[PDB]
Amino acid sequence: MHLICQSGDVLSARYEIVDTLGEGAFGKVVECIDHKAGGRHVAVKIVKNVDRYCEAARSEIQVLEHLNTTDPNSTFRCVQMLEWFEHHGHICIVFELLGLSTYDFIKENGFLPFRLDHIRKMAYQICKSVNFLHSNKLTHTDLKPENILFVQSDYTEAYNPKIKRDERTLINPDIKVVDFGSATYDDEHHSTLVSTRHYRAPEVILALGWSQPCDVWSIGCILIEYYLGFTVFPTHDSKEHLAMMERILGPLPKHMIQKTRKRKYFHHDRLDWDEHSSAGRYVSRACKPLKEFMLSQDVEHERLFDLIQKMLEYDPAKRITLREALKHPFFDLLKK
Ligand SMILES: O=C1N=Cc2ccc3c(-c4ccccc4)c(Br)[nH]c3c21
Ligand SMILES: [Br-]
Ligand code: NA
């Protein structure tokens, strides 16, 4: 891929590569000049020439033709796909050009959180967008801050005496949702494993089956990360992940424990986790009950945390739907 994704390379006798916007497992996304469309900049996803990513790219193209036809104006803020082509055996998907991902903005700003009023707007848009998917018999399955992009990531920058550091303040917090290569229709095969680990729902970890509610779980994780500026379940070990969950949210429901095929995590229907081991003391000291993460007792913080708590309901059958989430009091300040 390195040989065809360089600055200056031309794709499909039309798109001149400017630079790389980001890289993933799948390949990379590059900003290009569209020399046919008078020099307009676009984003081109160059997909690795590897079966699993080719297949996901083909699936993404189908999902986006469906979504972009149903919502041609992007009222529901899914990214607009413009075209696709093949270039030296790589599938390339052209999209409208967006700004930084919400993840990169956090990272570039030194892992500082977003302001609450921005979180409120971003959350509403994310819920609206994913609800539109949920209304069309789709589950995204891979929601994460890297897949939520600012329409424009421009910021103002000033020294802030309070934290004795320069600080970027986002100008326009409008977002779009990207990456529909894992999105699954209600009547299609469900992989056992979905979502990036940190955003993965307990029903997925426990291999209990999943559907739209697993997106809601991922959104809860995203919102807490927007609030705090860091990932709340940063581990790569499933058992430790579940231990973190229990410290933050309390014990898993017994019926879910009883149903799982992943017997290895449990012993006599409780998590098989030594709280006094090294890893265990770390989980106790670093994690804590969800509400203790609040940085203020002000009612707007309480409202956000009530919503996050409901999104992080363990039992997916009881978890708040995005339809209900859009009516939550946290969003009242957006409404006339
Ligand atoms: O500007 C864009 N218009 C569509 C699009 C899709 C994915 C991206 C990404 C991206 C996201 C996750 C991992 C790697 C890259 C960036 Br950063 N910019 C993108 C755009
Ligand atoms: Br980015
Ligand atoms: Na998770």
Residue numbers in the entry: 0, 148 to 482
Cite, word for word, the article reporting this structure:
The protein kinase CLK1 (cdc2-like kinase1) modulates activity of SPF45 by regulating its expression and by phosphorylating the protein at distinct serine residues. The CLK protein kinase family is closely related both in structure and function to the family of dual-specificity tyrosine phosphorylation-regulated kinases (DYRKs). 3-Aryl-substituted 6,7-dihydropyrrolo[3,4-g]indol-8(1H)-ones were identified as inhibitors of the CLK protein kinase family.
The structure analysis revealed a binding mode resembling the orientations of 8g in CLK1 and of 8a in CLK3. While the lactam substructure of 16 forms hydrogen bonds to the hinge region, the indole nitrogen is connected to the hinge via hydrogen bonds through a water molecule. For accommodation of the bromo substituent of 16, the entrance to the ATP pocket is somewhat widened compared to the situation found with 8g.
